[PDB]
Amino acid sequence: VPLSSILLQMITGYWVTQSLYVAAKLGIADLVADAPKPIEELAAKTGAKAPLLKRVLRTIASIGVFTETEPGIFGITPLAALLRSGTPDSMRPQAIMHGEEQYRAWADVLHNVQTGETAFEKEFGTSYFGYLAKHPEADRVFNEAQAGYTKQVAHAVVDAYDFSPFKTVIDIGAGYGPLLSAILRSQPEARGILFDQPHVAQAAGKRLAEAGVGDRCGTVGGDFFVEVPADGDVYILSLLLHDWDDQRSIEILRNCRRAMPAHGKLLIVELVLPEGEEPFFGKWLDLHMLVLLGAQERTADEFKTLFAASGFALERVLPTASGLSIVEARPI
Amino acid sequence: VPLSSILLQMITGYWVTQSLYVAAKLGIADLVADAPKPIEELAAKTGAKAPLLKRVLRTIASIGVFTETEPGIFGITPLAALLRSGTPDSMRPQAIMHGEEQYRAWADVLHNVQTGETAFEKEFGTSYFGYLAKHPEADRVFNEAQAGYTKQVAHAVVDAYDFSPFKTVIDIGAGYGPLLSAILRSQPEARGILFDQPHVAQAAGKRLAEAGVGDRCGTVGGDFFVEVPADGDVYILSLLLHDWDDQRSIEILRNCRRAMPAHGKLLIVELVLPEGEEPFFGKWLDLHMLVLLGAQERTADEFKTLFAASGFALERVLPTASGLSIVEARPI
Ligand SMILES: Nc1ncnc2c1ncn2[C@@H]1O[C@H](CSCC[C@H](N)C(=O)O)[C@@H](O)[C@H]1O
Ligand SMILES: Nc1ncnc2c1ncn2[C@@H]1O[C@H](CSCC[C@H](N)C(=O)O)[C@@H](O)[C@H]1O
Ligand code: NA
Ligand code: NA
Numbered sequence: 001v002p003l004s005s006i007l008l009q010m011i012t013g014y015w016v017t018q019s020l021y022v023a024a025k026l027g028i029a030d031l032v033a034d035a036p037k038p039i040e041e042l043a044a045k046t047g048a049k050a051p052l053l054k055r056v057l058r059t060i061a062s063i064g065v066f067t068e069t070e071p072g073i074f075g076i077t078p079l080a081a082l083l084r085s086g087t088p089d090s091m092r093p094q095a096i097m098h099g100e101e102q103y104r105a106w107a108d109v110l111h112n113v114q115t116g117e118t119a120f121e122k123e124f125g126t127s128y129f130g131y132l133a134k135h136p137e138a139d140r141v142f143n144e145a146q147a148g149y150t151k152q153v154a155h156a157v158v159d160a161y162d163f164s165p166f167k168t169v170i171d172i173g174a175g176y177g178p179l180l181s182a183i184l185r186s187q188p189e190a191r192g193i194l195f196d197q198p199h200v201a202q203a204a205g206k207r208l209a210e211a212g213v214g215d216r217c218g219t220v221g222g223d224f225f226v227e228v229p230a231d232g233d234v235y236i237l238s239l240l241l242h243d244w245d246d247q248r249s250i251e252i253l254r255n256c257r258r259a260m261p262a263h264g265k266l267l268i269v270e271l272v273l274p275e276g277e278e279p280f281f282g283k284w285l286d287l288h289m290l291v292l293l294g295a296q297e298r299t300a301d302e303f304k305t306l307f308a309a310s311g312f313a314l315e316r317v318l319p320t321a322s323g324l325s326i327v328e329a330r331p332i
Numbered sequence: 333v334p335l336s337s338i339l340l341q342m343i344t345g346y347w348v349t350q351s352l353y354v355a356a357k358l359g360i361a362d363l364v365a366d367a368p369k370p371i372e373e374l375a376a377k378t379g380a381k382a383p384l385l386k387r388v389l390r391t392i393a394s395i396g397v398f399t400e401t402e403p404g405i406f407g408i409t410p411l412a413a414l415l416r417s418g419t420p421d422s423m424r425p426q427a428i429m430h431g432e433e434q435y436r437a438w439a440d441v442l443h444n445v446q447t448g449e450t451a452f453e454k455e456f457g458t459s460y461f462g463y464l465a466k467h468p469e470a471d472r473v474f475n476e477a478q479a480g481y482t483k484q485v486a487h488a489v490v491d492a493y494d495f496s497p498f499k500t501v502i503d504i505g506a507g508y509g510p511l512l513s514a515i516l517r518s519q520p521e522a523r524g525i526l527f528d529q530p531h532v533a534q535a536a537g538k539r540l541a542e543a544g545v546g547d548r549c550g551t552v553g554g555d556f557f558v559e560v561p562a563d564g565d566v567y568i569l570s571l572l573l574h575d576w577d578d579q580r581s582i583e584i585l586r587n588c589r590r591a592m593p594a595h596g597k598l599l600i601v602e603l604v605l606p607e608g609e610e611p612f613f614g615k616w617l618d619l620h621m622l623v624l625l626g627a628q629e630r631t632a633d634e635f636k637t638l639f640a641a642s643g644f645a646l647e648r649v650l651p652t653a654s655g656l657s658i659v660e661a662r663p664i
Contacts, residue, residue: 004484007414007423010395011352011430013345015616018441020343025442052445052622059615063342068609082339091339098343099442107436109350110357113384152336277400281340283391284347290384 014103019060020083021099024092028057028066029076029083036067036075089152093144101131101138105291118294128292133199143176143200150239151178153322157269160320161328163187163234166265170232171195172224172256173240176204179269180236181213192217193229224252230259238269242289242297246306253310260331266312268327273299281323303327346435352397352415353431354388356424360398361408361415368407421484425477433463433470437623450626460624465531475532479508479539482571486514488654489601495519495566498597502564503527504556504588505572508536511601512568513543524549525561556584562591570601574617575625578638585642592663598644600659605629613655635659 023029026046031037039057043050057074061067065083069075082091105120112119120128132139163169163183167190171180174194184192194204198221208214220229225248228235235256241249256266271282286297298306304314312329319325355361358378363369371389375382389406393399397411414423433456440451452460464471495501495515502525503512509526516524524545526536530553540546552561557580560567567588573581588598603614618629632649639646639661650658 002484003410004414004421004423007352007397007411008426010348010397011423011427012616013348014350014430014435014438015619016342016345018346018438019619020339022442022445026445048445049448052448055618055622055628056445058609059619061609062611062615065339065342071607078335079339079342082336089336091336091343094340095343098346099439103346103439104436106346106350107439109388110354110431113354113358113380113388116381116384152334277390277393279394281337283394284344286387287347287351287391290387296387 016060016063017098017103019056020065020095021103022056023060023065023080024083024095025099026053027085027092028074029080029092030085032066032074032076032080033084036069036073039072039074042074089148091148093141093148097141097145100141102288102292109287109291112291119291120293129197133197139199140203143203146239147176147178150175151182153320153324154179154182156320156322157238157324157326158182158186160318161267161326163190166190166233168193168232169234169236170229171236171238172228172252173237173243174204175200176207177217179238180217181208183236184216185213190216193232194219195222195224195229197221197223224255226255228255228259231261232259232264233261234265234267235260236267236269238267240270241268241306242270242285242295243293244295249306250309253306253312257311257331262331264331266329266331268303268329269324270327271297271323272303272317272325272327273297275299300327303329348395349430349435351388351392352427353435354385355392355397355412356415356427357431358385359417360389360406361412361424362417364398364406364408365413365416368401368405371404371406374406421480422476423480425473425480429473429477432473434620434624441619441623444622448626451623453626461529465529471531472535475508475535478571479510482507483510485652485654485656486511488652489570489656489658490514490518492650492652493599493658493660495522498522498565500525500564501566501568502561503568503570504560504584505569505575506536507532508539509549510539510543511570512549513540513545515568516545516548517543522548525564526551527554527556527561529553529555556587558587560587560591563593564591564596565593566597566599567592568599568601571603573600573638574602574621574629575627577627581638582641585638585644589643589663594663596663598661598663600635600661601656602659603629603655604635604649604657604659605631607631632659635661 039054040050043053057066065079067075067077085092105123108119108122124131132142169183169190169192172195174180174196177194180192180194184190201219201221205219208217273282282297289295300317307314307329313332315328315330317325317327371382371386375385389398396409398406399409401407417424437452437455440454444451456463464474500523501515504527506512506526506528512524512526516522533551533553537551540549605614614629621627636646644661645664647660647662
């Protein structure tokens with residue numbers, strides 16, 4: 001395989017994103033979950049032009065997403081099973097999210113690199129979370145995508161740290177709270193507080209009650225730039241600080257330090273950037289955080305610098321059976 | 333390597349397109365072609381913010397495109413060498429092309445599949461070639477990208493067909509003419525006519541001179557929906573009909589039919605679609621043709637239909653060592 005074909009496949013990655021977006025957004029996987037279906041039925045049920053849908057499905061089937069079981073009849077595959085709606089490991093929200101506003105923001109990453117102006121803010125006229133707070137459907141998609149990402153790695157975080165000492169667990173910017181839920185499931189003596197923006201914390205609470213897992217979890221709606229809940233034994237910032245530049249991260253951390261009792265601990269759960277040139281998903285997420293939020297992933301030394309500015313000291317960086325690390329800090 | 337990670341890497345293909353686009357557009361490969369350079373110097377020369385450019389470069393370095401030779405110093409790799417400007421195998425124009433209007437048009441592929449409305453025309457308010465004729469920088473990029481792709485497959489076409497019987501070879505919509513040039517190189521006694529829009533035919537002369545065939549190859553500007561040049565021994569349509577719907581393709585073919593002499597041959601060089609589920613670049617290019625042009629790749633049976641409507645009969649479909657096939661037809 002010539003180098004030119006390797007590079008061409010890289011350059012054309014956007015085709016894959018959008019072709020999978022089409023299949024995800026139309027909900028094809030749900031329609032073929034029981035048995036393969038003819039193209040005309042799939043088109044009719046999804047509101048697509050049959051010959052055009054056929055072309056999209058043939059193309060992604062060639063990389064293992066759906067399969068043409070007989071001419072004009074399409075079935076599910078292992079990769080397409082992840083695009084079903086409402087299943088425990090669904091990645092449908094992720095496929096949807098990456099084909100919409102985030103795709104468009106990324107059209108201007110060059111301008112962002114040249115000027116420092118956050119690409120999403122240029123494209124849509126306000127901050128990422130400010131935008132989502134105005135658009136409930138996009139908000140739902142983001143929160144479900146984010147929760148699906150974290151749900152899949154939560155077990156690895158729980159296997160990597162002893163949570164026994166903590167009876168009150170405060171998750172700051174918890175989203176829909178899959179990691180908090182996993183911690184509570186594993187520690188039957190613990191109670192949790194799921195802290196987020198009011199609209200997110202309200203929806204998270206209903207999701208917990210629905211799933212019947214909110215007995216020892218309460219929700220609090222607030223603003224971590226103003227204050228966070230007091231008296232927790234551990235404060236968890238999971239996939240949170242990489243949303244914020246240094247100035248804003250320091251603000252969050254100082255509010256955590258204010259609220260925390262002196263016996264409390266701080267846990268940062270994130271894709272800590274390694275040394276060297278090996279492949280790492282966090283190197284790519286780092287650029288996504290640039291485009292959307294004007295933020296970044298960080299090295300251990302960068303966290304140390306944030307901690308010194310916020311009244312914390314790094315205790316240790318614990319690895320996990322995922323890309324994530326736990327950065328443990330103590331109040332000083 | 334969990335399935336969920338495989339699918340996430342597919343969904344995030346757009347990040348790769350855009351990150352390579354930044355490095356290509358800024359011209360980093362030319363800056364480091366002869367020796368590695370520190371990020372400060374790269375930032376200064378390109379008008380980029382150093383910390384942000386460093387992040388992009390270290391991310392693409394982790395997939396083999398550039399290398400961090402020491403901290404904050406970057407050098408070339410074989411994949412990044414393909415992003416240099418003006419080199420014989422340059423893919424710089426392809427990387428630029430795919431990150432700009434074509435990327436933005438692909439944001440609307442769902443709507444195109446739902447409604448049949450061409451995504452590029454929705455996004456830009458005009459046809460693809462109409463846009464390019466008014467945007468010189470994008471036009472040069474397109475034409476150089478297209479010629480670079482075709483150059484890498486031209487030997488496979490010439491190897492698959494004996495061009496020795498033809499005294500005059502006419503290439504309809506030839507662009508900058510790399511296939512025509514390969515044909516003429518292979519047959520020193522042959523004369524060529526390159527036909528394209530006036531602005532393209534005008535620019536092609538310089539490329540034909542560089543290719544060493546300029547002394548034997550005329551450049552004719554015009555519109556193939558009106559007329560094409562008469563009396564050629566063979567008329568070549570290479571990566572041409574896939575730009576046009578059936579009706580417009582028939583218009584082109586009928587003009588070729590009335591220009592052609594009775595002993596003439598028609599050769600269509602295209603990514604003819606196969607029936608199975610194997611990987612095939614033409615499956616992806618077929619979607620690209622939808623998005624940009626409201627067009628398609630075709631099967632042999634589809635070409636027979638067009639030929640019946642335009643006074644031609646299929647003679648043979650010849651395979652090549654590339655994805656391309658040669659559809660040979662005769663006037664009836
Ligand atoms: N000012 C603010 N106050 C509280 N929460 C905020 C906030 N600004 C953003 N957030 C929340 O920060 C979260 C970032 S996403 C991280 C979600 C989750 N902790 C996980 O591990 O996946 C979102 O749920 C968002 O609503
Ligand atoms: N109406 C028209 N008349 C003449 N050429 C046209 C045209 N509309 C589009 N084209 C040309 O059709 C070409 C399509 S791209 C194919 C280029 C080349 N044959 C190759 O093998 O790569 C472009 O060069 C474009 O300028
Ligand atoms: Na296709
Ligand atoms: Na762009």
